[PDB]
Design a protein around this nucleic acid. Structure first.
Ligand code: TTP
Ligand code: MG
Ligand code: MG
Length: 380
DNA sequence: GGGGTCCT
DNA sequence: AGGACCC
């Protein structure tokens, strides 16, 4: 019934770097964060470089790999919002997923375009891009026609993104978010594909690991592996009763639906972010004097970002990670502090954060943090 | 890794 | 405050 598109930018961070320094769009490029190559351009993947590879592995496997540092997300974040703002011009309800993916519900727009078409030009309606599984099109099938118009809009989207932002990316068009997202990566990079309904099963069964289904992550997949469940079909087939009584009703019914390619979740308007955070990770921080300096650094950046935003946060959170998950402490931001932008908001915010710090770190007893993070949320 | 979302 | 998910 619905016509949903999923847009997915090509090697996002690397693409941004290649644009900032066009002297790089010729070379294999990797974006580095500490010891990780979080992503690389397609010249690099040709040479054996994979996403999230160790710089050691990447170096050895590709000594001519140019590395740029991508620990500061400022520019990626800015381009990211330019992308969704551009998509919002097509339809106001755009849902972000991470920095480089967006869903848009095109069905109202598709409907509008059809109501305007004439008889002799419905003939006549064509696909833009790939048709998944080379499935043949039936122009008399109104579902095929709607999905085809979807593909046309999707191509207008990719064209605008290139023309206005210089950004290249993939699109997937299908009847729900799950399927749009699975199909958008079938032809990469910088291409698009549309999923006709009779090819839905082929798409879901094309997956080789149950983790490949968006919504099934490390923990959930590990549990399923424990239950003898490894293929999509194993999950499709497993006893709903037993599944429920091992993962709970909510998860069980949702992921089991997902395994059939069913996903009724609406595309949601993401809008402005609901939180701003900054982190730094390190081998060791073992003194409060360090912690405070670290935190002042993080807080400085955040205050810059809150500044531009316009809205004001009403709670602060401090996150740590002890040597060998994470722990957090939050509290509301005093009413008087919330009026800042010209004054000196630093010293009182660091005072609050340090109270939070000592609340979860015994400073009289040696400690070994390996991450510090500050988060502003409850924006108003 | 350096972010972000929602649910319990 | 933690846990799970997504990138
Ligand atoms: C998965 C993941 C992505 N990212 C960032 C790096 C990526 O540039 C960006 C989007 O990730 P992806 O969309 O998963 O991959 P990509 O856009 O870099 O490359 P492609 O889609 O062509 O395969 O998010 C992280 O920082 N940490 C992570 O764990
Ligand atoms: Mg991408
Ligand atoms: Mg998954």
């Amino acid at each position: 019934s619905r016509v949903i598109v999923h847009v997915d930018l090509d090697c996002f961070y690397a693409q941004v770097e290649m644009i900032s320094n066009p002297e790089l769009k010729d070379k294999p490029l990797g974006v580095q964060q500490k010891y990780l190559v979080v992503t690389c351009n397609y010249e690099a993947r040709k040479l054996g470089v994979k996403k999230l590879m160790n710089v050691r592995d990447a170096k050895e496997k590709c000594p001519q790999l140019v590395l740029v540092n991508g620990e500061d997300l400022t520019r990626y974040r800015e381009m990211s919002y330019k992308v969704t703002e551009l998509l919002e011009e097509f339809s106001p309800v755009v849902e972000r997923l991470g920095f480089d993916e967006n869903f848009v519900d095109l069905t109202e727009m598709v409907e509008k375009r059809l109501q305007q078409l004439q008889s002799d030009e419905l003939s006549a309606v064509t696909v833009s891009g790939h048709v998944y599984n080379n499935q043949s099109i039936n122009l008399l099938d109104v579902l095929h026609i709607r999905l085809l118009v979807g593909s046309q809009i999707a191509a207008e989207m990719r064209e605008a993104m290139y023309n206005q932002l210089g950004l290249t990316g993939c699109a997937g068009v299908a009847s729900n978010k799950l399927l749009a997202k699975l199909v958008s990566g079938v032809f990469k990079p910088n291409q698009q594909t549309v999923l006709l309904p009779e090819s839905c099963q082929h798409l879901i069964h094309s997956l080789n690991h149950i983790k490949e289904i968006p919504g099934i992550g490390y923990k959930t997949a590990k549990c399923l592996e424990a239950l003898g469940i490894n293929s999509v079909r194993d999950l499709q087939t497993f006893s709903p009763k037993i599944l429920e009584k091992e993962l709970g009703i909510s998860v069980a019914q949702r992921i089991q639906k997902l395994s059939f390619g069913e996903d009724n979740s609406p595309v949601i308007l993401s809008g402005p972010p609901q939180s701003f955070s900054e982190e730094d990770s390190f081998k060791k921080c073992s003194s409060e004097v360090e912690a405070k300096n670290k935190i002042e650094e993080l807080l400085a950046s955040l205050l810059n970002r809150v500044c531009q935003d316009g809205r004001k946060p009403h709670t602060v959170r401090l996150i740590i990670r002890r040597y060998s998950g994470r722990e957090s402490r939050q509290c509301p931001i005093p009413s008087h502090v919330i009026q800042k932008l010209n004054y000196d908001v630093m010293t009182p915010m660091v005072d609050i954060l340090m109270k939070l710090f000592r609340n979860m770190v015994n400073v009289k007893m040696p400690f070994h943090l390996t991450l510090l993070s500050v988060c502003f949320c409850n924006l108003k």
